[PDB]
Every structure is written in structure tokens, then in C-alpha cells.
Amino acid sequence: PLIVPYNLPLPGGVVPRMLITILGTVKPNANRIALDFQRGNDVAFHFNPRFNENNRRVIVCNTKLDNNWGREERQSVFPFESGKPFKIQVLVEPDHFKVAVNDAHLLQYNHRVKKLNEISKLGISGDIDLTSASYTMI
């Protein structure tokens, strides 16, 4: 087991062809999960499954600059399930982060923070038991 919130350093920042894989299990009474790719205090890519936003399950994605959240990108496809194991894969492509959950493509998030090699940490938080968090080049 890995302790949550967990920080995964991304040495030298992200680059296209970098694949991040996260394995965990959603807790039974889950409310929220967050992945935060950070550039110092800024959040280049926030990926945030919400299990009960006005009785809806939604994934909210956004960027935080100078402590301000920007325009949200919302996805109603919701592949997480309370109490169940999951795999998140985040592939850095030249123009977007590409996310798959349990081997099925979920969404893409266009790069708003363009200094990719300054996105040096990934935070993992929320209502999960975290099994593994790693990266490799494809």
C-alpha cells in the first residue's frame, strides 16, 4: 500500500510518450478522487471524479493558475465504481493528456500549461486505496 495523498515526482517534467499508470481501489463510500499534475503551485491538469455532485457522477477536469481555476471540461462517462479496483493510464501526447480507465479511452485534455518539462509532480488524493503509481516511456 501507498499512503494517500501521494506525491509522484516526475523527474525533468513530462514529455510526449510518457505513460503514467495508477492502480488502486475506490473506497466503498467514495465522494471524490483527484489527480493533480503540478507546475509549482499551478495545476496543469486536474482530473477529478465526483461521485455525488447533485446526485450525478461526473469527471471534472481543469487547470489552476495563480490560485484561480479556469474553464471546467466535464465528462459524464464515469468508469469508476465504489469499492472496485481500477487502473488509470495517462499518456502524454504532444498536444493533450490522453486518459484511459480500465483499458478504455476516457478523455483527452488539451495542454493549457505548455512548459511540459516544468510539470514536475503528480499528486494523487481522495477516496482510494492506492496500490501503485509509476511511469514509463512508450
What is the closest distance, in whole angstroms, from the C-beta atom of residue 74 to ligand D9J in the complex?
9
CA pair distance 50, 47, nearest whole angstrom: 10
| 93 annotated ligand binder | no
Q: Is the peptide bond before 94 cis (omega within 30 degrees of 0)?
A: no
Q: Among candidates 130, 135, 126, which has minimal Cα distance to 32? A: 126
Stretch that binds ligand D9J, among 26-34, 82-90, 111-119, 129-137 (CB under 6 A): 26-34
Q: Helix, strand, or coil here: 117? A: helix
CA–CA–CA angle 136, 83, 38 (5° rounding)? 40
Closer CB to ligand D9J, residue 34 or residue 116?
34
With CB under 6 A as the contact rule, the residue among 10, 18, 20, 34 that binds ligand D9J is 34
Q: Are 135 and 11 in contact (CB under 8 A)?
A: no
Cα radius of gyration (the chain):
14
Closer CB to ligand D9J, residue 33 or residue 122?
33
With CB under 6 A as the contact rule, the residue among 47, 48, 88, 90 that binds ligand D9J is 48
Q: According to the binding rule CB under 6 A, does residue 125 interact with ligand D9J?
A: yes
Residues in region 67-86 near ligand D9J by CB under 6 A? 69, 72
Binding site for ligand D9J (CB under 6 A): 32-34, 46, 48, 60, 62, 69, 72, 125-126
